Design a protein around this motif. Structure first.
Motif, PDB file in Angstrom:
ATOM      1  N   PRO A  31       0.771  -1.232   0.000  1.00 56.96           N
ATOM      2  CA  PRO A  31       0.000   0.000   0.000  1.00 56.96           C
ATOM      3  C   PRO A  31       0.818   1.308   0.000  1.00 56.96           C
ATOM      4  O   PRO A  31       0.281   2.336  -0.375  1.00 56.96           O
ATOM      5  N   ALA A  32       2.086   1.281   0.406  1.00 60.07           N
ATOM      6  CA  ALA A  32       2.916   2.484   0.314  1.00 60.07           C
ATOM      7  C   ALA A  32       3.106   2.963  -1.109  1.00 60.07           C
ATOM      8  O   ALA A  32       3.512   4.104  -1.316  1.00 60.07           O
ATOM      9  N   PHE A  33       2.858   2.092  -2.089  1.00 56.47           N
ATOM     10  CA  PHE A  33       3.105   2.418  -3.478  1.00 56.47           C
ATOM     11  C   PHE A  33       1.843   2.636  -4.289  1.00 56.47           C
ATOM     12  O   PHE A  33       1.910   2.675  -5.509  1.00 56.47           O
ATOM     13  N   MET A  34       0.714   2.866  -3.628  1.00 52.33           N
ATOM     14  CA  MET A  34      -0.554   3.073  -4.352  1.00 52.33           C
ATOM     15  C   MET A  34      -0.566   4.404  -5.052  1.00 52.33           C
ATOM     16  O   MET A  34      -1.219   4.565  -6.083  1.00 52.33           O
ATOM     17  N   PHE A  35       0.141   5.371  -4.486  1.00 49.48           N
ATOM     18  CA  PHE A  35       0.230   6.673  -5.113  1.00 49.48           C
ATOM     19  C   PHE A  35       1.454   6.827  -5.994  1.00 49.48           C
ATOM     20  O   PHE A  35       1.774   7.946  -6.365  1.00 49.48           O
ATOM     21  N   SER A  36       2.120   5.716  -6.356  1.00 47.21           N
ATOM     22  CA  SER A  36       3.196   5.771  -7.312  1.00 47.21           C
ATOM     23  C   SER A  36       2.631   5.620  -8.729  1.00 47.21           C
ATOM     24  O   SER A  36       1.779   4.783  -8.970  1.00 47.21           O
ATOM     25  N   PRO A  37       3.114   6.433  -9.669  1.00 46.16           N
ATOM     26  CA  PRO A  37       2.582   6.325 -11.022  1.00 46.16           C
ATOM     27  C   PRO A  37       2.913   4.974 -11.692  1.00 46.16           C
ATOM     28  O   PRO A  37       3.872   4.290 -11.305  1.00 46.16           O
ATOM     29  N   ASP A  38       2.111   4.605 -12.685  1.00 50.32           N
ATOM     30  CA  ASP A  38       2.341   3.361 -13.437  1.00 50.32           C
ATOM     31  C   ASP A  38       3.670   3.363 -14.196  1.00 50.32           C
ATOM     32  O   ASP A  38       4.232   2.301 -14.448  1.00 50.32           O
ATOM     33  N   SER A  64      20.382   1.848 -10.909  1.00 46.35           N
ATOM     34  CA  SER A  64      18.997   2.010 -10.455  1.00 46.35           C
ATOM     35  C   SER A  64      18.615   0.956  -9.404  1.00 46.35           C
ATOM     36  O   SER A  64      19.134  -0.167  -9.402  1.00 46.35           O
ATOM     37  N   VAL A  65      17.701   1.341  -8.517  1.00 45.83           N
ATOM     38  CA  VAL A  65      17.337   0.559  -7.338  1.00 45.83           C
ATOM     39  C   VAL A  65      15.826   0.382  -7.321  1.00 45.83           C
ATOM     40  O   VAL A  65      15.099   1.298  -7.663  1.00 45.83           O
ATOM     41  N   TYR A  66      15.356  -0.801  -6.919  1.00 49.25           N
ATOM     42  CA  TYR A  66      13.931  -1.108  -6.931  1.00 49.25           C
ATOM     43  C   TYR A  66      13.474  -1.744  -5.639  1.00 49.25           C
ATOM     44  O   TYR A  66      14.239  -2.438  -4.957  1.00 49.25           O
ATOM     45  N   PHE A  67      12.208  -1.499  -5.326  1.00 47.37           N
ATOM     46  CA  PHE A  67      11.455  -2.282  -4.357  1.00 47.37           C
ATOM     47  C   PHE A  67      10.872  -3.434  -5.169  1.00 47.37           C
ATOM     48  O   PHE A  67      10.196  -3.209  -6.186  1.00 47.37           O
ATOM     49  N   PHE A  68      11.148  -4.651  -4.725  1.00 40.11           N
ATOM     50  CA  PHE A  68      10.970  -5.853  -5.529  1.00 40.11           C
ATOM     51  C   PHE A  68      10.064  -6.782  -4.769  1.00 40.11           C
ATOM     52  O   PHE A  68      10.380  -7.159  -3.644  1.00 40.11           O
ATOM     53  N   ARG A  69       8.913  -7.106  -5.345  1.00 36.02           N
ATOM     54  CA  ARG A  69       7.946  -7.969  -4.681  1.00 36.02           C
ATOM     55  C   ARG A  69       7.957  -9.329  -5.349  1.00 36.02           C
ATOM     56  O   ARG A  69       7.799  -9.419  -6.566  1.00 36.02           O
ATOM     57  N   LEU A 134       7.098  -7.737  -9.195  1.00 34.33           N
ATOM     58  CA  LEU A 134       6.693  -6.326  -9.286  1.00 34.33           C
ATOM     59  C   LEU A 134       7.922  -5.514  -8.927  1.00 34.33           C
ATOM     60  O   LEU A 134       8.479  -5.674  -7.848  1.00 34.33           O
ATOM     61  N   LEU A 135       8.398  -4.716  -9.872  1.00 32.55           N
ATOM     62  CA  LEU A 135       9.457  -3.752  -9.608  1.00 32.55           C
ATOM     63  C   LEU A 135       8.854  -2.337  -9.490  1.00 32.55           C
ATOM     64  O   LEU A 135       8.180  -1.859 -10.409  1.00 32.55           O
ATOM     65  N   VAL A 136       9.088  -1.701  -8.344  1.00 30.47           N
ATOM     66  CA  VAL A 136       8.718  -0.301  -8.107  1.00 30.47           C
ATOM     67  C   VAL A 136      10.015   0.466  -7.999  1.00 30.47           C
ATOM     68  O   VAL A 136      10.821   0.199  -7.113  1.00 30.47           O
TER      69      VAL A 136
END
Length: 179
Positions: A31-38, A64-69, A134-136
């Motif tokens: 949910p921390a990434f719901m307001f992140s653009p597509d 580059s660095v990602y939050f990785f699910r 999922l990469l954010v």
């Protein structure tokens, strides 16, 4: 603990340490990434086969660095930070101080720990129930969202934390950033 991967993201992208000043559970970061653009979100479906995952990993820039699910679509997620470590010549997944492992070899193919990301005998895809990655992008704003979300969730509640993320673009003042 969720804070550990966020601190790590901050070190790599913001050149800084984060101190969460808690003066009074474990978190799903999703949910921390719901307001992140597509435009900062990419879904991989390449985890049936070793080959396809290695060419997914090869498409990423190594500064580059990602939050990785990892996990299933709509299901339980395991969040970690993905980044390229120049010293060890490979992509690394970092969940916490205790839990981290290298993902790729010196020349871009999966290490033994990294092959743990595959599930050969399962369905991979966009749809509910499938496996995916999922990469954010760990942009400054996504790092800020993650820090603020976790901080407000612990000190208050999850509704408050999503409401805060809806409006706030800077670190919460109790989250101390120093270079």
């Amino acid at each position: 603990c969720a804070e550990m991967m966020i601190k790590k993201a901050a070190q790599l992208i913001l050149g800084s340490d984060l101190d969460f000043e808690y003066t009074r559970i474990q978190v799903d970061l999703g949910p921390a990434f719901m307001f992140s653009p597509d435009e900062e979100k990419t879904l991989w479906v390449s985890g049936k086969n070793q080959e396809t995952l290695e060419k997914d990993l090869a498409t990423l820039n190594k500064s580059s660095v990602y939050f990785f699910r990892t996990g299933t679509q709509g299901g339980a997620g395991h969040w970690q930070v993905l980044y390229y470590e120049a010293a060890k010549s490979g992509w690394v997944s970092y969940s916490s101080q205790s839990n981290h492992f290298q993902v790729t070899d010196s020349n871009g193919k999966l290490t033994a720990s990294g092959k743990g990301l595959l599930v050969p005998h399962a369905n991979w895809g966009k749809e509910n129930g499938n496996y995916a990655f999922l990469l954010v992008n760990a942009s400054a704003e996504n790092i800020i969202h993650a820090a603020n979300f976790v901080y407000i969730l612990r000190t208050q509640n999850e509704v408050a934390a999503i409401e805060y993320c809806a409006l706030n673009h800077e670190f919460h003042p109790e989250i101390k950033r120093t270079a």
